[PDB]
Every structure is written in C-alpha cells, then in structure tokens.
Design a protein around this ligand. Structure first.
Ligand SMILES: CC(=O)Nc1nnc(S(N)(=O)=O)s1
Ligand SMILES: CC(=O)Nc1nnc(S(N)(=O)=O)s1
Ligand SMILES: [Zn+2]
Ligand SMILES: [Zn+2]
Lengths: 224, 225
C-alpha cells in the first residue's frame, strides 16, 4: 500500500516495496511541460473515437475515482492496437504546462495485448458544466467501493474536439511507477463546473497528484 | 571481467550479474535501431562540437574496447549544460543501426557535466578513404589488455564529420551499469576508414563488441533540421 502523504508518500514509494524501484528512476511521470525541452513536429493523428460506454463500472479505490470500460475500443497508434481499459481522475493536475496547473487531469489508460501502455491525459479548467461528468459523480462511491452506472457515457465529450497533443516517454504516476509508458497530453483543456469539482473532491481523496519529476535527457514533442 | 559480450556474462545476463546492473533490463536502453517510423524532424539545439588538440593521450585496451582518455579539458555546451569530454572509444560493428543498416565502426565521445549528466556523441564510419587520425591510435593500441601513452598529437575533429546534423533520443550507457537518463546524439553523416584500418582494429580490440539493439518502447527519435 502507498498514499500521497505521510511515510507512504511519493518521496518514500521506492522504499515501500522492491517492485517500486522504478519510482526513483530517470524516465518518470508526471513532468512539467517546459518549452526548453520541447520541440514542435508533425505527429501521428490521434484517432480515439470511442464507442458509447454502457454499464461502465465506477470505482473508488482510495487513490482515485476510476471508470472501467466494458466495450472493446481500439486505438491504432504507430501500428499498435491499444485497448482502452479505464479512465480516472487527479485533482489537481499531475502534469503542469509551463508551470500552469489545472484543477483536474483525466487519464485514459490503454494497453496492447502484449503489455504496451499508452495514457492519454486531458486537462480540465473551471467553466461550463460537463454533461458526462455529472453521470459519473452521481453514482461515485464516497468511500472505497464500486458501482455500475445505469446511464451511457459518451467518452468523447470528456476529451477536447481538437486533438492537437504533446507526447513523451514516461511512466505510471503511481507505484510501481513502471516506465516505457507512452504519454499523450492534449493541448486543449475541456471544462468542468466549480460544482462538479467540489463534488469530485467530496468523494475522491485529494490532493492525489504526484509531484512533477526530473526531465533528465528527454524531449517533449508537440504536434501540429 | 565483471561482464562480457558472450557466455554467462553476456548481454542478456548483465542485469543478473550485480545489483548495480539492474538498469540493463529496463525500458530506455541503448543502442537502438534508428527507424523512420519512430523519428520526426524538428528544430534542435545547434551542435557546437570542436575539440582541442589531444596531446599525450592515453590509449587503453580494457578488454571491452579501445579507449582514448584525453588530458585536455574540452567543454560541450548543450541546453545550458556544460559537458566535459572524458574519453572516446570504439565499437565494431556499430551499436546503433540506421534503418536496419549496420556500419563497420561506431565511435563514442563520452561527455559528463559536473553534476552527472551524460551525453554521448556517436559517429559512424563507413569503409572508404583511410583516416589518418585512426592510424596514430591503431599504431600504438595494445593488442593485449594494457595502456600506451601517445607521443603524437591527435586531432579528434578529424574523426568527426564536417556536417554536424544529428539525431537524438533518451537512452543509456551501452555497457553495464547501463545507467539511463543518457542524452544520445548520433551524427547523420559518417566518416570513412579503410578496410585495412578496420582489420587492424579487429586485430587488437575485442570484437564484435556491440550490444544488441534494444526495444524502442515509448520513445521518439528527433532529427534536427
Ligand atoms: C493498471 C493501471 O492502469 N495502473 C495505473 N497506475 N497509474 C496509472 S496513471 N496515473 O499513470 O494513469 S495507470
Ligand atoms: C565510464 C563510462 O564512460 N562508461 C561507459 N559505459 N558505456 C559507455 S557507451 N558505450 O554507452 O559510450 S561510456
Ligand atoms: Zn492517473
Ligand atoms: Zn560505447
């Protein structure tokens, strides 16, 4: 077990279990997207276009609020077939952009049959209410537990229509912090209402963002 | 030796030889195959690479390669960091491959900042015109593990192409401990060495001494305009 505070906090993760050794390495996430270590180049188109999510499972695992997806969605990227497994929340955001923090960051976790992991991160700023998020928050357990959502979700409405993104090689932001993770962070944020942010914080442990990590020898590539 | 390119201490076993070699089995290892599929072209920092004449440099045969330790203090300024050249050595055949293509020789110029940041510049060599600088090195390079101090000066710049355009990615040392967080810079244009020079090098240096290419995993390679 680990947490975001105390002796089980981020600074002590690598010491909690032998399998968490990754947490202290050189290609960790999240990071601050710094212009100094960023280049601009044409990157592969990001084609998500998820299927409607029916009877998805909303889980409170003591670390975040996660939504497990039942349908088989395929994200074709660099010839690999990534399957969306779930998406979850972090408040405040884990990545920062030019030191700017967002009240919410959404992670859509995908994995290929052979284990390759690709996470799509979406920032959210306070603004207009997001219709999909209310469906999730209305049934999200305030304590560790799981609940099946009776309403369908249009996952595409939790992602900006404009798919321009930045990418870099990183890791999982929670123990074991495994590296070799392909990170894709959307440039444009979506919006959520103050009310939704308050509601999320009333049911999810927070703050639950890992401190930004050292960039080391990595370059961030921002697409067009 | 603590590790080798063959046998029980070979590449696939490095990580299991010592706790300090755990890096060798991770996700951001070098060398790699430079494949267009995982590469983009962009505006990268200009590579200002020029070395001082190397005088009385030490040529060492450490059983893993032929390494030249220079006495001078050369600084490579990159991204606000000041990297000092520590030494350069050889690999045959090449460690990195370009679009599946292998070169007879790859030269590594290893630099490190004061705070431990490692930057290795790799230069490929294709068979062709003989390289005079290489001859000075080969003429004194120990055939058996040992060391020999050069009396002649070396112009390291003649082992580097005039065209400084390069490709870069985040990787590791290609030999144990295989530490990651290494900044790799591979020149696009190769230099040339005569077939005879390659034969001479293989007569004194352990070969093949190239580590198998590693999985690219979630990395991108960037080539500068
Ligand atoms: C099984 C699984 O997906 N685990 C994750 N752990 N951290 C993740 S994150 N915050 O990097 O998206 S995903
Ligand atoms: C002390 C030192 O420089 N060690 C190195 N180990 N591998 C290197 S390489 N082949 O990646 O240039 S340099
Ligand atoms: Zn996450
Ligand atoms: Zn080397």
């Amino acid at each position: 077990e680990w947490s975001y505070e105390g002796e089980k906090g981020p600074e002590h993760w690598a010491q909690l279990k032998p399998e968490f050794f990754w947490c202290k390495l050189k290609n960790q996430s999240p990071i601050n997207i710094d212009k100094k270590y960023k280049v601009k180049a044409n990157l592969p188109k990001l084609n998500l276009y998820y299927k409607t999510a029916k009877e998805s499972e909303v889980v409170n695992n003591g670390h975040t609020i996660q939504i497990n997806i039942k349908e088989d969605n395929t994200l074709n990227y660099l010839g690999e077939k990534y399957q969306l497994k779930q998406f979850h929340f972090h408040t405040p955001s884990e990545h920062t952009i030019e030191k700017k923090s967002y009240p919410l960051e959404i992670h859509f976790v995908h994995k290929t049959e052979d284990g390759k992991i690709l996470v799509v991160g979406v920032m959210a700023k306070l603004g207009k209410t997001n219709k999909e998020l209310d469906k999730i928050l209305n049934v999200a357990p305030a304590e560790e537990g799981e609940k099946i959502l009776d309403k369908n979700l249009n996952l595409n409405n939790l992602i900006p229509k404009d798919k321009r993104y930045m990418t870099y090689s990183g890791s999982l932001t929670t123990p074991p912090c495994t590296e070799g993770v392909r990170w894709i962070v959307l440039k444009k944020p979506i919006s959520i209402s103050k009310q939704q942010l308050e509601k999320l914080k009333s049911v999810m442990v927070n703050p639950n963002n890992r401190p930004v990590q050292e960039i080391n020898s990595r370059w961030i590539i921002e697409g067009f």
